[PDB]
Ligand binder design. Structure first.
Ligand SMILES: *[C@@H]1O[C@H](CO)[C@@H](O)[C@H](O)[C@H]1O[C@H]1C[C@](C)(N)[C@H](O)[C@H](C)O1
Length: 7
């Protein structure tokens, strides 16, 4: 991970 979202 390390990214974000939310999906
Ligand atoms: C997502 O990242 C932001 C920026 O660093 C934080 O401020 C936030 O608390 C964080 O969201 C938490 C809560 C969430 C959305 N339910 C997920 O569990 C994420 C991984 O962590």
């Amino acid at each position: 991970x390390x990214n974000x979202x939310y999906x």
